C-alpha cells in the first residue's frame with residue numbers, strides 16, 4: 188500500500204489501496220488504477236487512463252499520452268484502456284485514442300519491452316509480446332499471443348493474427364496472417380510459426396490442418412480467392428482454419444505477400 | 447506563467463514570463479526560451495539552447511545534449527537553435543553542435559515524434575516530420591515539409607529535399623531528392639511523393655512538371671549528367687524544377703539510386 | 706564529491722567519495738560505484754550493479770534492470786558488471802544477468818549511444834561502440850573495438866568479432882566475423898572493415914594477411930571447412946588470422962552469409 192512522497196498524483200485519480208507509485212512519478216486526474224498494479228519511478232499516467240489489476244509500469248513508461256496525430260484536438264477527453272497482468276518496461280510509450288468512442292485498448296497478459304510504442308487507437312488482445320524498440324502506428328490491431336520482435340514497424344490499419352511472429356527489423360505494411368511468420372524489408376510471409384504453435388501446445392493434428400490450409404492458399408498454384416473457396420467446399424473445417432479464412436476475407440489492407 | 451516548484455532552473459536562464467516548466471525538469475545556464483513555450487516533466491534543456499516561441503517539449507525530451515562524437519571537446523560552448531511552433535515528443539533527443547560557429551538548427555513548425563533523434567550539427571528547415579524512433583546522424587540536412595517515417599536511419603552529410611518522403615525502416619545513405627519517395631534497405635527512390643505534393647496543394651501543372659523532370663532524369667535511358675543538361679536546354683523551367691537540378695548538382699554524397 | 710539532495714540513494718550502496726549523482730536519480734542497495742564515475746539526472750542504478758572507475762551515465766540511463774525474459778525469477782540476485790571509462794548516453798538501457806553466476810559484463814572504454822540496449826547476459830569487451838537505438842538481445846557477445854551502427858538488432862547467442870562493423874539497420878542473425886563489415890536485411894558480410902583496421906593502426910602487412918585469409922574463406926570457390934584447413938596447412942599464421950580461424954570453428958549459430 189506504499190506510495191512515495193515525491194509522487195505528484197491528482198486528488199481525483201481513483202487508485203486502489205494496494206497500488207504502489209514510485210519516486211517522481213506523475214498521475215493525472217481522470218485516472219483509474221485497480222488492485223495490485225505497481226508503478227515504478229518517473230512513470231507518467233495521463234488523463235483518460237483506465238488501468239486494471241496486477242499491471243507493472245517500469246521506470247519512465249508513459250501511459251495515455253497525446254496521439255501523434257497532427258489533426259487531433261488536444262482538448263478532447265479520450266481513453267487508454269488497459270486490462271490485467273500487463274508489463275510495461277522502461278520508457279515504453281502508450282498513446283490514447285483520438286475519439287471519445289475509440290480508446291486505445293490493451294487486454295491482459297501483454298508484455299511491452301523497453302522503448303516499445305503503441306500508437307493512438309491500437310487494439311491489442313491478450314498475451315502479446317511487443318519487443319524492444321518496436322513501434323505500432325495508430326490503428327494497429329493485434330489478436331492473441333502475437334510475438335512482435337525487436338525494432339519492427341507496423342503500418343496503420345494492419346491486423347496481426349493470433350500466434351503469428353514478426354522477426355527483427357521487419358517493415359510490416361499489410362496484415363500478418365494467423366499462425367504465420369513474417370520477415371524482412373520488404374516483408375513477406377516466410378512460413379508457419381511452428382515454434383509458437385508448439386509452445387502453445389497445439390496438437391499435431393491442428394498444426395497440420397493449419398499447414399494444409401496454408402498449403403492450399405500459398406503452395407498450390409492458385410489465386411488466394413480460389414484457395415479460400417476450395418478450403419470451404421472441402422467440408423467441415425476446424426475453427427483455427429475458419430479463422431484463417433475469415434481473416435483473409437475481412438482484411439482491409441490485404442495480407443502480406445508470401446516469400 | 448506557472449512553473450513547478452520541483453524544477454531545477456538556473457538563475458541565468460532567460461525564460462520569458464509566459465513560459466511553463468513541468469515537474470522535475472532541469473534547465474541549465476546559457477539558455478534562452480521565448481514566449482509561449484510549454485515544457486512538461488523530466489525535460490532537460492542544456493547549455494547553449496536558444497528556444498523560440500510556442501514550442502512544446504513533452505516528458506523526458508532532452509535538448510542540446512552532448513554530441514555523440516568521441517572527438518568532441520565537452521568544455522566547448524556550442525549551440526542548439528530552435529525556432530517557433532515546434533513539437534518535441536516524449537524522450538525525443540536533440541544534440542548540440544560540435545563547433546562554436548556550427549549550431550544544430552531547427553526551424554519552425556517541425557514535429558519530432560517520441561524517441562526520435564537529431565544528431566550534432568543537423569540543419570532542419572520548416573514543417574518537417576521526424577517519426578517515432580527515427581534517427582538522423584550528425585550533419586544531416588532537411589529542407590521543408592520532409593516526412594521521415596518511423597525507425598528510419600539517415601547517414602551523416604545526407605540532404606533530404608523538400609516534400610520528400612522516407613518510408614519505415616529505410617536505410618538512407620545518400621540524398622533523398624525533392625518531391626520524391628525513398629524506401630528500403632538498401633533504399634531506393636521509389637517514385638514521386640504525389641500524396642505530399644497534393645496535400646501541399648501543388649497544382650497539377652507543377653506536379654506534372656516535377657513528373658516530367660524526373661521522367662527525363664530517371665526514365666529516359668540517359669545518364670543523370672545528360673538528363674540535367676537536357677532539362678536546362680529545354681528552356682524556361684519552373685523554380686521547383688530548377689531546385690531539382692540544383693539539388694542534384696550540389697549533392698555531396700550523391701543521390702539515392704532509383705528503383 | 707557533490708551529490709544532489711533530491712537523489713534517492715540506498716544507505717548500503719557503496720559509492721566512492723569522488724562520485725557524483727545528479728537530480729532525481731535512484732540508486733538501490735547492493736550497488737558498488739568506484740572512483741570518478743559521474744551520474745547525471747534521472748539515472749537508475751539497480752541492485753546487483755558493480756560499476757568501475759571514470760564511467761559516465763547521462764540522463765535517464767537505466768542500469769541493471771530486470772531481464773526481458775518471461776521465465777526469469779525476479780527475486781534472484783543477479784549482477785551487472787561494468788568496467789572503467791564507459792559512457793552510457795541518454796536513456797541507454799542495460800539489463801542484468803539471469804543467473805547468479807552469469808552477470809551482464811561490460812569491459813572498458815565502451816560507448817553506448819542514446820536509447821541503445823544491452824540484453825540480459827550479454828558479454829562485451831573493450832572499446833566497443835553501440836550506436837543510437839541499437840539493440841542487443843540476451844546472450845550477445847562483442848569482442849573489442851566492434852562498431853555497431855544505428856538501429857541494428859542482434860539476435861541472441863551471436864558473437865561479434867574484434868574490429869568488425871555492422872551498418873545501420875542491419876538485422877544480425879549469425880556471427881559477425883572479425884575485421885569484417887556486415888550489412889542489410891537479410892544481412893551479409895560485405896567485405897573487410899578496412900577503415901576500422903586502418904584507424905586502429907594495423908600495418909598493411911597484417912591487413913593484407915587478414916585480406917588473404919578471407920580471400921581463401923570467401924573468394925576461392927571452396928567450402929568454409931576446406932578454406933580453414935587450407936589456411937592452417939599454409940604454415941605459420943599471424944595471431945589475427947589464427948583468431949579468424951578459431952572464431953569460425955567455435956561459432957555456435959554459424960557465421961553471417963557472405964554477399
Ligand SMILES: CCCCCCCCC[C@@H](O)CC(=O)N[C@H]1[C@H](O)[C@@H](CO)O[C@H](OP(=O)(O)OP(=O)(O)OC[C@H]2O[C@@H](n3ccc(=O)[nH]c3=O)[C@H](O)[C@@H]2O)[C@@H]1NC(C)=O
Nearest residue numbers: 319334337352355382383773824841842843858859860861
Ligand atoms: C533480429 C534479432 C532481434 C533481437 C531483438 C532483441 C530485443 C531485446 C530482447 C532482450 O533484451 C531480452 C531477451 O532477448 N529476451 C529473449 C531471451 O534473450 C531469449 C533467451 O535467449 O528467450 C526469449 O527469446 P525467444 O527467441 O522467444 O526464445 P528462443 O531464443 O529460445 O527461440 C529461438 C527462436 O525461436 C523463434 N520463435 C520464437 C517464438 C515464436 O513464437 N516463433 C518463433 O519462431 C525465434 O525466431 C527465435 O529465433 C526472450 N524473448 C525475446 C522476444 O527475445
Ligand SMILES: CCCCCCCCC[C@@H](O)CC(=O)N[C@H]1[C@H](O)[C@@H](CO)O[C@H](OP(=O)(O)OP(=O)(O)OC[C@H]2O[C@@H](n3ccc(=O)[nH]c3=O)[C@H](O)[C@@H]2O)[C@@H]1NC(C)=O
Nearest residue numbers: 255306323324325340341342343578593596611614641642
Ligand atoms: C512502415 C510503417 C511505419 C509505422 C511507424 C509508426 C510511427 C508511430 C506513429 C503513430 O504513433 C501515430 C500515427 O501513426 N500518426 C499517423 C496516423 O496514424 C495516421 C492516421 O491513420 O495519420 C498520419 O499518417 P499518414 O500515413 O501520414 O496519413 P495516412 O495514413 O492517411 O496516409 C496513407 C499513406 O500516405 C502515404 N504518404 C503520406 C505522406 C506523404 O507525404 N507521402 C505519402 O506517400 C504514407 O506512405 C501512408 O502509407 C499520422 N502520421 C504518421 C507519420 O503516421
Ligand SMILES: CCCCCCCCC[C@@H](O)CC(=O)N[C@H]1[C@H](O)[C@@H](CO)O[C@H](OP(=O)(O)OP(=O)(O)OC[C@H]2O[C@@H](n3ccc(=O)[nH]c3=O)[C@H](O)[C@@H]2O)[C@@H]1NC(C)=O
Nearest residue numbers: 514565582583584599600601602837852855870873900901
Ligand atoms: C545508416 C546510417 C545510420 C545513422 C545512425 C546515426 C546514429 C546517431 C549518430 C549521431 O547522433 C552522432 C554522430 O553521427 N556520430 C558520428 C559523427 O556524425 C561522425 C562525423 O560526421 O563521426 C563518426 O562517424 P563515423 O562514420 O564513425 O566516421 P566517418 O563519418 O568519418 O566515416 C565515414 C564512413 O566510415 C565507415 N566506417 C567507420 C568505422 C569503421 O570501423 N568502419 C567503417 O567502414 C562508416 O560506414 C562511415 O560511413 C561518429 N560516429 C558514428 C557512429 O556515427
